Design a protein around this nucleic acid. Structure first.
Ligand SMILES: [K+]
Ligand SMILES: [K+]
Ligand SMILES: [K+]
Ligand SMILES: [K+]
Ligand SMILES: [K+]
Ligand SMILES: [K+]
Ligand SMILES: [K+]
Ligand SMILES: [K+]
Ligand SMILES: [K+]
Ligand SMILES: [K+]
Ligand SMILES: [K+]
Ligand SMILES: [K+]
Ligand SMILES: [K+]
Ligand SMILES: [Mg+2]
Ligand SMILES: [Mg+2]
Ligand SMILES: [Mg+2]
Ligand SMILES: [Mg+2]
Ligand SMILES: [Mg+2]
Ligand SMILES: [Mg+2]
Ligand SMILES: [Mg+2]
Ligand SMILES: [Mg+2]
Ligand SMILES: [Mg+2]
Ligand SMILES: [Mg+2]
Ligand SMILES: [Mg+2]
Ligand SMILES: [Mg+2]
Ligand SMILES: [Mg+2]
Ligand SMILES: [Mg+2]
Ligand SMILES: [Mg+2]
Ligand SMILES: [Mg+2]
Ligand SMILES: [Mg+2]
Ligand SMILES: [Mg+2]
Ligand SMILES: [Mg+2]
Ligand SMILES: [Mg+2]
Ligand SMILES: [Mg+2]
Ligand SMILES: [Mg+2]
Ligand SMILES: [Mg+2]
Ligand SMILES: [Mg+2]
Ligand SMILES: [Mg+2]
Ligand SMILES: [Mg+2]
Ligand SMILES: [Mg+2]
Ligand SMILES: [Mg+2]
Ligand SMILES: [Mg+2]
Ligand SMILES: [Mg+2]
Ligand SMILES: [Mg+2]
Ligand SMILES: [Mg+2]
Ligand SMILES: [Mg+2]
Ligand SMILES: [Mg+2]
Lengths: 153, 206, 84, 100
RNA sequence: AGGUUAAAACUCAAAUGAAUUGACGGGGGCCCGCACAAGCGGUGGAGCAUGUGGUUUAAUUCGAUGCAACGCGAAGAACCUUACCUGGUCUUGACAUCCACGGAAGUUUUCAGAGAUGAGAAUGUGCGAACCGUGAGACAGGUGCUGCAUGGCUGUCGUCAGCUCGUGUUGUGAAAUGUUGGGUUAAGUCCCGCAACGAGCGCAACCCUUAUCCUUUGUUGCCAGCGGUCCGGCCGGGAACUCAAAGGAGACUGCCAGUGAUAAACUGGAGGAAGGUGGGGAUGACGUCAAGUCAUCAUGGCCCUUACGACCAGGGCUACACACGUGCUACAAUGGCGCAUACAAAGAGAAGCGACCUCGCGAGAGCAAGCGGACCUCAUAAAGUGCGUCGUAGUCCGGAUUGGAGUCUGCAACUCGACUCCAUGAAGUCGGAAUCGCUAGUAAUCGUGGAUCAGAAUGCCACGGUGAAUACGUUCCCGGGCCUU
């Protein structure tokens, strides 16, 4: 906004684990305000992921995030003449928001049976730098690489 | 743009209703239609009696009409003769026993309905519209109004292109809800068509 | 359609017109405006001329017209296609 | 509304009362489950003989002050236009501008 | 190359200078708004609903018709409505007044006719003046024309922060000042300065509602402690509580700290249900668009008068090569289907809402309580949750279309109703260019009610349940405010 009068909203931690980080991921996955339906999907995928690895539900989730979080992105910048895609540092919070959004978007595009299984296969490949989401993080880093010359606009 | 009706917006705040009975849905529509025919008759019969406001009540199987006026002797007549002639027509119309009360409008120069009717009668007599509005505004300001506004619209002076003109003195704060604002309108039927008159009179915040 | 517990509807003025002509040899066309009348199993034969809004069109009542209303055989709108 | 159109509703209101009881018992027969099959037939044929304007479904609520056949409100018996004019003049008891 | 000297015919009623107020700029500066950006969900594609253009028609009645017409007037066209068409009919007349004369008014039936109506035929004749019929002529009647003659009412810029006046002063004058400037604010908000000093209309406040608490009152509403109990606030009771609705309390940048021009104010903290306009509504300045409406009504003028008035039946407003707008339902597994099982708010009802019970596969029917309602009825909330199944298929997705058979409202559902049952099982597998809404209890999604109304919502108006994402910023797009050029 013009006036910059936008503070922050508190988010409740998830029931099973008490992680606000995970509770946002349920929110990104939720549609039509059906939160319980999204809570179940996340919990099921998290257990399939917990037994597909040796780590707890959280530590396997963080390892998935660490491979999808972008560090630098490009934003347009119209100045006296034309517009350059300037590479900008992604702030720590937006790193998590982008990582979660790409995971949920990639999993929705798969072709497995349930959404709980699709989310599980994406969270697993994200631990091995495979599949989409991880690739989306690669395409963003490439664009920000080819525009490093414009890192002062 | 368009303005809210100054009377309606204050009806529960500082202004009273003009009809004060109670009814269920079964007769609400029939009470409204009989109040309409009563006022339609009283207004036509008492055209020269300076009738400002006709208040109608309905205590119980009976109707009580209160006629606010500045010429009550004209309303009443000799030894209450004329006021009796209406007490029969009203009962005929309402279909219940009728009772008429005559209230006193003192200072008719401070009543919006009477001021609007004064200007309108003058316009039908081919008085200069400018002179009528100034007189009305000066009178009310002299009698102690805190403000007044008069507006006249139509083919003023028989002009081909209609227009609106208005004067104002003192304060007329239409956005203040607790402001005592007496507002009423009137219409003149000249040889060139209808001319509309609106009158606001401010009497102090409550 | 009309409830069964009420029986098919027939305009009373038409019911008299078919009675006065089934018993006789009146083969003159019956001119009616009663498109709402159900066709009964008693005038299979003669021609009722039904109104369509601007004239009476003759329908030759056969058996298979029983149960239909008269108006089903007198179209009201005139159409021939656009630019056809 | 036109004067003729106003007079059409006063006629339809009168005829709906003059034939009120005569219409109700005929439909009592037709709706009667355990009547016969020929008096039902006669009652059906007899109902069509009464003038059409005697059925209450032929009436159209009109603004009692103008005759407008649209925007009617039953609680006041007036069109939406006349309801507003009377409401702002304080001529409808208890009625004020709402806000919640 | 051209320079220099230098006409006329003809033609126009101006051409021109400086300055003033606006508006505008692909001029400058400073600000604002779901205006971008950051996001989430849609439209444009499909089927269907609905409005409009067009075409068609005897008629497809009239109006609205960039934003600001197109689920608009219409909060509900089978007849009615109805204003249109076809045909059948009337002429002081369907609706008023006046006069003459006839008759109480009314009820009860017969024929002709689609009906209007016509001709009758019975019964009453009560209590002038009711109320009918007829006869004259003043007149009535018109949804006929002009919204570019009008009143009233409305849209719109825009809920934008503006718009002005008196006196004074400046200028030959149009005009200027005030109203600009330095800060500040959501605000022409406030402070300070100042040839201005004051005032008005706007802003804010006063109003409704929502969030906390108190007091009073305690049934049809309530159940903490009691006492019984068929475990049902069911009964005795209880006035605590939830709640109902009256009256009060509460928020003021008041308090504290810093900042600031010893100012206005701002940034943060405390207390508090609530913190800086708490949330939402109502409230629309001077004016603008000869904006909309002569078809709500009113009205100047014009026009028609055995007709442009009035009555009737049937038809039409529902047409259909097509084009657009607004919606609804989908394309599925965050789902479909089956079973079980929770938790709302708001409202309506007497020619009305209609329980129970029985009958029907069902829409409904018969019988029949209760309720003009904190009591009775509408009236099971649905999403949700548990268990099963389906296993990615044009399918157990989707439900268009069509056949057959019914119900209900209504004189009457052919044109042209809604709903039910059985069968049928279309397009559609996420939508080109393009385009819309939304900043929080919002969007999205899920049901519920109401007005209109005999019947007839996917529209409109209202109500709760669940319940997000994102906003770094103001360069760009759109609209706007202030100063300057
Ligand atoms: K010359
Ligand atoms: K659409
Ligand atoms: K106007
Ligand atoms: K000068
Ligand atoms: K001055
Ligand atoms: K006119
Ligand atoms: K029709
Ligand atoms: K729709
Ligand atoms: K199927
Ligand atoms: K129909
Ligand atoms: K689409
Ligand atoms: K209805
Ligand atoms: K400028
Ligand atoms: Mg009229
Ligand atoms: Mg109707
Ligand atoms: Mg020379
Ligand atoms: Mg955007
Ligand atoms: Mg479409
Ligand atoms: Mg049209
Ligand atoms: Mg037009
Ligand atoms: Mg417009
Ligand atoms: Mg709309
Ligand atoms: Mg019709
Ligand atoms: Mg004709
Ligand atoms: Mg206009
Ligand atoms: Mg001077
Ligand atoms: Mg200004
Ligand atoms: Mg100035
Ligand atoms: Mg300043
Ligand atoms: Mg001010
Ligand atoms: Mg100043
Ligand atoms: Mg205000
Ligand atoms: Mg006990
Ligand atoms: Mg604080
Ligand atoms: Mg308004
Ligand atoms: Mg115009
Ligand atoms: Mg127009
Ligand atoms: Mg017109
Ligand atoms: Mg008709
Ligand atoms: Mg239509
Ligand atoms: Mg299915
Ligand atoms: Mg209802
Ligand atoms: Mg296909
Ligand atoms: Mg598929
Ligand atoms: Mg906003
Ligand atoms: Mg809904
Ligand atoms: Mg400003």
């Amino acid at each position: 906004p013009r006036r910059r009068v936008i503070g922050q909203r508190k988010i409740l931690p998830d029931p099973k684990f008490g992680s606000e980080l995970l509770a946002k991921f349920v929110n990104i996955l939720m549609v039509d305000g059906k939160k319980s339906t999204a809570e179940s999907i996340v919990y099921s995928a998290l257990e399939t992921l917990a037994q597909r690895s040796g780590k707890s539900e959280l530590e396997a989730f963080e390892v998935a995030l660490e491979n999808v979080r972008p560090t630098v992105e490009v934003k347009s910048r119209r100045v006296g003449g034309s517009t350059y895609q300037v590479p900008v540092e992604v702030r720590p919070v937006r790193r998590n928001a982008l990582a979660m959004r790409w995971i949920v978007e990639a999993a929705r595009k798969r072709g497995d049976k349930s959404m709980a299984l699709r989310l599980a296969n994406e969270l697993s490949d994200a631990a091995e730098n495979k599949g989409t989401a991880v690739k989306k993080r690669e395409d963003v880093h490439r664009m920000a690489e080819a525009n490093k010359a414009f890192a002062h606009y | 743009g368009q303005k809210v009706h100054p009377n309606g917006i204050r009806l529960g705040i500082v202004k009273p209703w003009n009809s004060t009975w109670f009814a269920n849905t079964k007769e609400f529509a029939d009470n409204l239609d009989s109040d309409f025919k009563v006022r339609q008759y009283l207004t036509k019969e008492l055209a020269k009696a300076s009738v400002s406001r006709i208040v109608i009540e309905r205590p119980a199987k009976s109707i009580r009409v209160t006629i606010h006026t500045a010429r009550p002797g004209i309303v009443i007549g000799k030894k209450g003769e004329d006021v009796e002639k209406l007490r029969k027509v009203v009962a005929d119309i309402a279909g219940v026993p009728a009772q008429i009360n005559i209230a006193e409008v003192r200072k008719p120069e401070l009543d919006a309905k009477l001021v609007a009717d004064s200007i309108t009668s003058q316009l039908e007599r081919r008085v200069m519209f400018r002179r009528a509005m100034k007189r009305a505004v000066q009178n009310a300001m002299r009698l102690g109004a805190k403000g007044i506004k008069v507006e006249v619209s139509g083919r003023l002076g028989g002009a081909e292109i209609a227009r609106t003109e208005w004067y104002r003195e003192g304060r007329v704060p239409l956005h203040t809800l607790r402001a005592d604002i007496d507002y009423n309108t009137s219409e003149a039927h000249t040889t060139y068509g209808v001319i509309g008159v609106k009158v606001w009179i401010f009497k102090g915040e409550i | 359609p009309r409830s069964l517990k009420k029986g098919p509807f027939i305009d009373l003025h038409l019911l008299k017109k078919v009675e006065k002509a089934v018993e006789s040899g009146d083969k003159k066309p019956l001119r009616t405006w009663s498109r709402r009348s159900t066709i009964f199993p008693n005038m299979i034969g003669l021609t009722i001329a039904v109104h369509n809004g601007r004239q009476h069109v003759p329908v030759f009542v056969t058996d298979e017209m029983v149960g239909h209303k008269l108006g089903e055989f007198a179209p009201t709108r005139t159409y021939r296609g656009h630019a056809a | 509304a036109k004067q003729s159109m106003k007079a059409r509703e006063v006629k339809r209101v009168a005829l709906a009362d003059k034939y009120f009881a005569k219409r109700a018992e005929l439909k009592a027969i037709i709706s009667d489950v355990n009547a016969s099959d020929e008096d039902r037939w006669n009652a059906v044929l007899k109902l069509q003989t009464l003038p059409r304007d005697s059925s209450p479904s032929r009436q159209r609520n009109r603004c009692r002050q103008t005759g407008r056949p649209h925007g009617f409100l039953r609680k006041f018996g007036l069109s939406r236009i006349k309801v507003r004019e009377a409401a702002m003049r304080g001529e409808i008891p208890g009625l004020k501008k709402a806000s919640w």
